Design a binder for this molecule. Structure first.
Ligand code: NUT
Length: 96
């Protein structure tokens, strides 16, 4: 079966975060250095919540400037409603 052959070894699609992103994920309670992309997104959400980087009045707005997270994103701020910067950063910082 060619569909099985294709997907064997590629059904979970684990990634290894680059060291600066791994440090963010650990800060959010993550353990180890291999994750699903879904786990990476969970821990990034949790990081923003526990470091209080979001605007209490406009909770979709993240103010990441002067945080390691803003360094990785290359941004002072972003909206979760317009997450192009997060896509860019994860493409660059998640290995295989
Ligand atoms: C209206 O207020 C909201 C609405 C949605 C999100 C959100 N939306 C989720 C989301 C957003 C964009 C992408 Cl590409 C993926 C997931 C996810 C998330 C995951 C990673 C990052 Cl870096 C930021 C947010 N994510 C969250 O992490 N949320 C989900 C809802 N409530 C929360 O406390 C946490 C949100 O996130 C805060 C952390 C800023 C706030």
């Amino acid at each position: 079966d060619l569909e099985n052959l294709y997907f064997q070894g590629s059904q979970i699609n684990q990634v290894r975060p680059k060291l600066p992103l791994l440090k963010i994920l650990h800060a959010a309670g993550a353990q180890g250095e291999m994750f699903t992309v879904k786990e990476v997104m969970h821990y990034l959400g949790q990081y923003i919540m526990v470091k209080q980087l979001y605007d209490q009045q406009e909770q979709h707005m993240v103010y990441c400037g002067g945080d390691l997270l803003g360094e990785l994103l290359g941004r002072q701020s972003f909206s979760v409603k317009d997450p192009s910067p997060l896509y860019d950063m994860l493409r660059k910082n998640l290995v295989t």
